[PDB]
């Protein structure tokens, strides 16, 4: 639950650590919304979102990839939450809204995932 055997775990152990970090992202107010849910480039009015981003990811797809077993390693998810944060940071460039949403999330996230990555690492 903090440090014992080899790093690599089961997506379940992960969730135990990771998910909580997610819920923290999820609890970051609408700042989370654009991630805890698929951007839906049709819903928001983006026809080329996947032309700006190469890997959009969404805490929905992440916490699901988390609830499905697509990590097997906590970092896997991390790259994905940093993914959705990265594409929000590149898509909206800077001085936007989701840039702010992604900023604090990266904060709580590193406030969760750091303690996570250490609980797992
Ligand atoms: C990529 C992008 C996304 C944007 N908004 N996204 C969302 C907005 C809302 S909300 O209804 O306004 O709260 C919700 C729930 C979810 C999302 C994903 C946006 N405004 C500009 C953008 O360039």
From Swiss-Prot:
Changing residue 50 to A: Impairs binding to acetylated histones. Residues 9-116 form the Bromo domain. Residues 48-94 are annotated as: Interaction with histone. Changing residue 104 to E: Abolishes interaction with ASF1A. Methylation of the KIX domain by CARM1 blocks association with CREB. This results in the blockade of CREB signaling, and in activation of apoptotic response. Sumoylation negatively regulates transcriptional activity via the recruitment of DAAX. It is found in: Cytoplasm; Nucleus. Residues 86-104 are annotated as: Interaction with ASF1A. It is linked to Chromosomal aberrations involving CREBBP may be a cause of acute myeloid leukemias. Translocation t(8;16)(p11;p13) with KAT6A; translocation t(11;16)(q23;p13.3) with KMT2A/MLL1; translocation t(10;16)(q22;p13) with KAT6B. KAT6A-CREBBP may induce leukemia by inhibiting RUNX1-mediated transcription. Rubinstein-Taybi syndrome 1: A disorder characterized by craniofacial abnormalities, postnatal growth deficiency, broad thumbs, broad big toes, intellectual disability and a propensity for development of malignancies. Acetylates histones, giving a specific tag for transcriptional activation. Mediates acetylation of histone H3 at 'Lys-18' and 'Lys-27' (H3K18ac and H3K27ac, respectively). Also acetylates non-histone proteins, like DDX21, FBL, IRF2, MAFG, NCOA3, POLR1E/PAF53 and FOXO1. Binds specifically to phosphorylated CREB and enhances its transcriptional activity toward cAMP-responsive genes. Acts as a coactivator of ALX1. Acts as a circadian transcriptional coactivator which enhances the activity of the circadian transcriptional activators: NPAS2-BMAL1 and CLOCK-BMAL1 heterodimers. The KIX domain mediates binding to HIV-1 Tat. Found in a complex containing NCOA2; NCOA3; IKKA; IKKB and IKBKG. Probably part of a complex with HIF1A and EP300. Interacts with GATA1; the interaction results in acetylation and enhancement of transcriptional activity of GATA1. Interacts with MAF and ZCCHC12. Interacts with DAXX; the interaction is dependent on CBP sumoylation and results in suppression of the transcriptional activity via recruitment of HDAC2 to DAXX. Interacts with phosphorylated CREB1. Interacts with CITED4 (C-terminal region). Interacts (via the TAZ-type 1 domain) with HIF1A. (Microbial infection) Interacts with HTLV-1 Tax, p30II and HBZ. This is CREB-binding protein. It comes from Homo sapiens (Human). The lineage of its organism: Eukaryota, Metazoa, Chordata, Craniata, Vertebrata. The gene is CREBBP.
